[PDB]
Design an enzyme around this catalytic site. Sequence first.
Site, PDB file in Angstrom:
ATOM      1  N   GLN A  11     -10.344 -25.810 -41.972  1.00  0.00           N
ATOM      2  CA  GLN A  11     -10.958 -25.157 -40.819  1.00  0.00           C
ATOM      3  C   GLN A  11     -11.419 -23.736 -41.136  1.00  0.00           C
ATOM      4  O   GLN A  11     -12.562 -23.374 -40.864  1.00  0.00           O
ATOM      5  CB  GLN A  11      -9.983 -25.124 -39.640  1.00  0.00           C
ATOM      6  CG  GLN A  11     -10.557 -24.466 -38.389  1.00  0.00           C
ATOM      7  CD  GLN A  11      -9.595 -24.477 -37.218  1.00  0.00           C
ATOM      8  OE1 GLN A  11      -9.176 -25.536 -36.754  1.00  0.00           O
ATOM      9  NE2 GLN A  11      -9.242 -23.292 -36.733  1.00  0.00           N
ATOM     10  N   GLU A 254     -20.435  -8.519 -64.041  1.00  0.00           N
ATOM     11  CA  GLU A 254     -20.222  -7.245 -64.724  1.00  0.00           C
ATOM     12  C   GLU A 254     -19.052  -6.492 -64.099  1.00  0.00           C
ATOM     13  O   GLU A 254     -18.238  -5.901 -64.809  1.00  0.00           O
ATOM     14  CB  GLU A 254     -21.483  -6.380 -64.687  1.00  0.00           C
ATOM     15  CG  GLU A 254     -22.257  -6.368 -66.002  1.00  0.00           C
ATOM     16  CD  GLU A 254     -23.243  -5.217 -66.103  1.00  0.00           C
ATOM     17  OE1 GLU A 254     -24.293  -5.389 -66.757  1.00  0.00           O
ATOM     18  OE2 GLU A 254     -22.966  -4.135 -65.543  1.00  0.00           O
TER      19      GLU A 254
HETATM   20  N1  LIG Z   1     -10.254 -15.705 -40.471  1.00  0.00           N
HETATM   21  C1  LIG Z   1     -10.106 -16.959 -40.053  1.00  0.00           C
HETATM   22  N2  LIG Z   1      -8.892 -17.595 -40.212  1.00  0.00           N
HETATM   23  C2  LIG Z   1      -8.730 -18.872 -39.788  1.00  0.00           C
HETATM   24  C3  LIG Z   1      -9.780 -19.556 -39.192  1.00  0.00           C
HETATM   25  N3  LIG Z   1      -9.344 -20.793 -38.874  1.00  0.00           N
HETATM   26  C4  LIG Z   1      -8.049 -20.907 -39.253  1.00  0.00           C
HETATM   27  N4  LIG Z   1      -7.653 -19.720 -39.813  1.00  0.00           N
HETATM   28  C5  LIG Z   1      -6.327 -19.405 -40.379  1.00  0.00           C
HETATM   29  O1  LIG Z   1      -5.941 -20.442 -41.262  1.00  0.00           O
HETATM   30  C6  LIG Z   1      -4.561 -20.730 -41.139  1.00  0.00           C
HETATM   31  C7  LIG Z   1      -4.395 -22.201 -40.773  1.00  0.00           C
HETATM   32  O2  LIG Z   1      -5.062 -23.005 -41.721  1.00  0.00           O
HETATM   33  P1  LIG Z   1      -6.288 -23.956 -41.300  1.00  0.00           P
HETATM   34  O3  LIG Z   1      -7.498 -23.706 -42.159  1.00  0.00           O
HETATM   35  O4  LIG Z   1      -6.623 -23.722 -39.851  1.00  0.00           O
HETATM   36  O5  LIG Z   1      -5.725 -25.455 -41.466  1.00  0.00           O
HETATM   37  P2  LIG Z   1      -6.435 -26.514 -42.446  1.00  0.00           P
HETATM   38  O6  LIG Z   1      -7.033 -25.824 -43.643  1.00  0.00           O
HETATM   39  O7  LIG Z   1      -7.497 -27.276 -41.699  1.00  0.00           O
HETATM   40  O8  LIG Z   1      -5.269 -27.521 -42.909  1.00  0.00           O
HETATM   41  P3  LIG Z   1      -4.657 -28.621 -41.903  1.00  0.00           P
HETATM   42  O9  LIG Z   1      -3.185 -28.378 -41.688  1.00  0.00           O
HETATM   43  O10 LIG Z   1      -4.827 -29.988 -42.515  1.00  0.00           O
HETATM   44  O11 LIG Z   1      -5.377 -28.552 -40.579  1.00  0.00           O
HETATM   45  C8  LIG Z   1      -4.005 -19.794 -40.077  1.00  0.00           C
HETATM   46  O12 LIG Z   1      -3.364 -18.688 -40.673  1.00  0.00           O
HETATM   47  C9  LIG Z   1      -5.232 -19.340 -39.322  1.00  0.00           C
HETATM   48  O13 LIG Z   1      -5.058 -18.049 -38.784  1.00  0.00           O
HETATM   49  C10 LIG Z   1     -11.004 -18.923 -39.029  1.00  0.00           C
HETATM   50  O14 LIG Z   1     -11.945 -19.516 -38.505  1.00  0.00           O
HETATM   51  N5  LIG Z   1     -11.162 -17.623 -39.462  1.00  0.00           N
HETATM   52 MG   LIG Z   2      -7.565 -28.528 -40.017  1.00  0.00          MG
END
Ligand SMILES: Nc1nc2c(ncn2[C@@H]2O[C@H](COP(=O)(O)OP(=O)(O)OP(=O)(O)O)[C@@H](O)[C@H]2O)c(=O)[nH]1
Ligand SMILES: [Mg+2]
EC number: 3.6.5.-
Lengths: 440, 67, 421
Positions: A11, A254
């Site tokens: 995500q 670089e």
């Molecule tokens: N900066 C930022 N952080 C995000 C965002 N979405 C999720 N996070 C952060 O990512 C962490 C959670 O991981 P995710 O990427 O949401 O989960 P995932 O990678 O889909 O892995 P799954 O458990 O399978 O859903 C948390 O610390 C969130 O605060 C975003 O759109 N922007």
């Molecule tokens: Mg996810």
Amino acid sequence: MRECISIHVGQAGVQIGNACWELYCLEHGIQPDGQMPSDKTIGGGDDSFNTFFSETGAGKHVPRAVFVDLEPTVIDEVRTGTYRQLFHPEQLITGKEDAANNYARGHYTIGKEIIDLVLDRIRKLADQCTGLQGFLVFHSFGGGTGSGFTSLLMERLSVDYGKKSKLEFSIYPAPQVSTAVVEPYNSILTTHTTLEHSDCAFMVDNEAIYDICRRNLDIERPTYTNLNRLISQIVSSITASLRFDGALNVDLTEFQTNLVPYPRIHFPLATYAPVISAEKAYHEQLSVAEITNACFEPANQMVKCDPRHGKYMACCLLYRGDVVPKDVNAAIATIKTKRSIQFVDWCPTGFKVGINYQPPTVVPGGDLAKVQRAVCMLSNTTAIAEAWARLDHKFDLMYAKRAFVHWYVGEGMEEGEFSEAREDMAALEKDYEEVGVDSV
Amino acid sequence: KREHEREVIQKAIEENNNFIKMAKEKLAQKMESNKENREAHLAAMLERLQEKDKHAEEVRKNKELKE
Amino acid sequence: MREIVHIQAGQCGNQIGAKFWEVISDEHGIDPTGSYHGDSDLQLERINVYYNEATGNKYVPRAILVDLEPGTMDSVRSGPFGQIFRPDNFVFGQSGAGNNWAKGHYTEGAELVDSVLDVVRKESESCDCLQGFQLTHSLGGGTGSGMGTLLISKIREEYPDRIMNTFSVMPSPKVSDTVVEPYNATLSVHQLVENTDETYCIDNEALYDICFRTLKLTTPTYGDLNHLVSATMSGVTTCLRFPGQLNADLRKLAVNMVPFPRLHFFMPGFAPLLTVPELTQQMFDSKNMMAACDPRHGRYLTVAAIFRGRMSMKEVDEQMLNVQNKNSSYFVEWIPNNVKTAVCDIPPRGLKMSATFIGNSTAIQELFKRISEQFTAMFRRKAFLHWYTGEGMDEMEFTEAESNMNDLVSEYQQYQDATAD
Ligand SMILES: Nc1nc2c(ncn2[C@@H]2O[C@H](COP(=O)(O)OP(=O)(O)OP(=O)(O)O)[C@@H](O)[C@H]2O)c(=O)[nH]1
Ligand SMILES: [Mg+2]
Ligand SMILES: COc1cc2cc(c1Cl)N(C)C(=O)C[C@H](OC(=O)C(C)C)[C@]1(C)O[C@H]1[C@@H](C)[C@@H]1C[C@@](O)(NC(=O)O1)[C@H](OC)/C=C\C=C(\C)C2
Ligand SMILES: Nc1nc2c(ncn2[C@@H]2O[C@H](COP(=O)(O)OP(=O)(O)OP(=O)(O)O)[C@@H](O)[C@H]2O)c(=O)[nH]1
Ligand SMILES: [Ca+2]
Ligand SMILES: [Mg+2]
């Protein structure tokens, strides 16, 4: 040539991908359907923006990007969003079941089912490259996919592409927007596993970004949309040298030479300026000296740490917009005689400078003021190890009681992987300590 | 010097291949180790459930030998 | 999508089960025919989690109605939203358990369980991606208690990689005069601690005390108790039913709430029974827990809290931070950031804003000690043991269930006493 392939995982990776690629399009004058009027070479080209975009005969400029998530609802929004025409359907890959904030499921149980398909789609982009430079990987530390699947992918990429360069943009967890209690576990596991396979990783502390949105943009409760639009600006500043040309332009590779004194010491600290609202930027011009001095205000860093209590091993300044070397040199000379800037004794103290004349851009309805000049400092400071220290401590608190460990063991992992991963982090903290000690 | 030049590029090739090789093998071992463990955990689960069935047979059995 | 298969067993299970479907059908804006008549697309974005979409845009609950007596089956079908349920998903015996756990678990239920599984299997196989099951039942009866725990074991045999969640209603002399209920509860808990991933402890003792002492309802009806249950069940599933970031599915909930597999018994809470500050103070108050436990008699391992309605999210963040700081002693320090806060801006029916609480507190042992106190006294008395041994049970299975629940209590005590250093 010198194509770069972006890979957006989970995500966080995907949604940051949305912000970055929207921003790139506006910077290069590319429309949501992929057309680029200013580009007269139809179907191909050797221009600087071709490092990130391929071209179809129909004139469509297509991101050299893959989006991957083990659950479909985030990427579905891309498939039906404003820039859906921008991506070929094969660039957008989804499973049916996410990793549930579990590294084990992302690396093993669920991830292994889709890893081959992902590598095939990545291969399809790479074969369109005449001179592939490397990969840029976007992911969170906390998610099960961001941590688990990323580390699996990075391992596989090292096998399929040898020593081809692999860069990371890693989202470091913050409690204000955290989604799982086990994000410290996922963080330590993926850091340990990816360490050998990454050449350079830019950490983005969500709390650092959260604070900047609150303090500098007056956003009471920042959303991911607020964070990502700010993050994409830092990413844009870092990739600008790859996407644009110029006399005073310095390639990211670089800077990389200077930023990585040892393989494991490849985590630069990013500091960006100016972050300011339209309301405040009105009738107020921030000069080269002002934005440069802002790079040494810890409040402006992408990672919470105190470089004033650490030592520098490199200092790079990446300017964009209305900037000339004279003003940069004057600003630096002032700063060195007023800031707490101290280098290790085995490294030269000169600041490495790059300038892209293409001015900063902002997305419509965004919180950032449009300014004539911006700067991103990339520094190598021992202080960034503080971020490891905080994560490792939280890891230790839970692992001492083996809290939540059964969720990982249930998916086939062993406690030995936790201890091995933690030992590596301890060695990494010690490494950052060792490099700061004066020579004998 | 020409011979040294050859040895240097041969060393770079060797170490690059050795890194690819060890990464490929290290990964294959992990996924295998993980497959065994997860299966062994699920197998132990079913076995415990399958003796709940055997127990239920013994209970119903014990009721017929109750009359 | 990510489907949940709902199961309701026994009288209690079907009662609260039906009210659950009434409340959320209203929130998602569908009538007892199964047609949609809402105004917001958010009502339908994750509708497939609990509903099957049929021809002519008809939404049918993915629900399986079970009981060893056909009485309640007619009640549901005649009750509101009775015509929305799938007819084939009605599975009834004729015998009736009579509050005998052995009959529900080993005898009468074991002969009906397969025809239930056939319905489970039919629903499951049509899922794009099944995430798991949720069961509504009581532990004091015979069917919902004994057969309910049989179904769980049977379902876990065919779906061992799925999440098993339960809404277990705990017995209380303040509501039921039945004397053998502490046998049925202990025997059930013996099963739930081994075979479920998440159990919401709905305690009739707490439900009674709330109605009587706060709502000031002397002579509380099951309708009064279930009004609390329905509001609670609506709250703890909001994150599953509407677009969200936090505990959006059963597995991610379990990973955030269960630090040790056996310790998966949650005490839910609800507020009110307003200002963002006192909403928060109430939901952490012992008077608002649906389990008869004082959270200040133990420590929180984990906590999930959802606020509902239009409100300042800045204020919610500040006050959730405030509560953790002023009550820092009641959250284990060896689990950093164990409290998670969600916000859905669509409120429940009648309330402009509410707050639902899900705590994994070591103070839950107070509930198990109550049951154990009755059970241990009954075991010495040996009052009504023949009804169980009459079905072929042994006296050890009573002893084993007792000591296993004793272990659960001492394990909750262990981690309550643990320190960082
Ligand atoms: N900066 C930022 N952080 C995000 C965002 N979405 C999720 N996070 C952060 O990512 C962490 C959670 O991981 P995710 O990427 O949401 O989960 P995932 O990678 O889909 O892995 P799954 O458990 O399978 O859903 C948390 O610390 C969130 O605060 C975003 O759109 N922007
Ligand atoms: Mg996810
Ligand atoms: C004359 O004195 C008394 C007479 C009776 C009960 C009591 C007293 Cl004191 N007491 C103390 C109770 O607490 C009630 C309770 O029963 C109830 O569930 C309720 C229907 C009353 C019960 C027996 O402990 C329950 C199970 C062992 C259950 C009993 C049954 O239901 N079937 C079965 O297999 O097991 C059975 O046959 C249908 C009918 C009811 C029994 C009889 C024995 C009356
Ligand atoms: N909160 C609440 N509790 C209920 C309700 N109905 C029954 N109970 C409780 O359930 C316990 C007994 O279990 P039941 O569900 O009635 O019995 P059963 O599971 O259908 O099993 P049998 O009746 O023996 O066939 C008692 O302690 C009751 O207090 C209800 O509608 N609401
Ligand atoms: Ca071109
Ligand atoms: Mg009944």
